[PDB]
Design a binder for these strands. Structure first.
Length: 67
DNA sequence: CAAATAAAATC
DNA sequence: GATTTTATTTG
């Protein structure tokens, strides 16, 4: 546990981290691959990529134990 | 495309 | 209420 709000599909996040770790961002042909697998509309696939950038920032902020 | 705060949702 | 995780957002 140890979490607040719930996320979407673990498969989506997993593949998101996968492609993200490959470089940072990918082409439309690659995003479409993820979209077809997550049943997304392509557009939101690119949004989640940007969201991943703030995700890591949140982790670094938590790794402080100042509260 | 990128950094992200709002914002909802769980606690 | 606090944290966390996405959508709306402008550069």
């Amino acid at each position: 546990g140890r979490k607040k709000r719930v996320p979407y599909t673990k498969v989506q996040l997993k593949e998101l981290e996968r492609e993200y770790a490959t470089n940072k961002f990918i082409t439309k042909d690659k995003r479409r691959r993820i979209s077809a697998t997550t049943n997304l509309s392509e557009r939101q696939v690119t949004i989640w990529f940007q969201n991943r950038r703030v995700k890591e920032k949140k982790v670094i902020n938590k790794l402080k134990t100042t509260s």
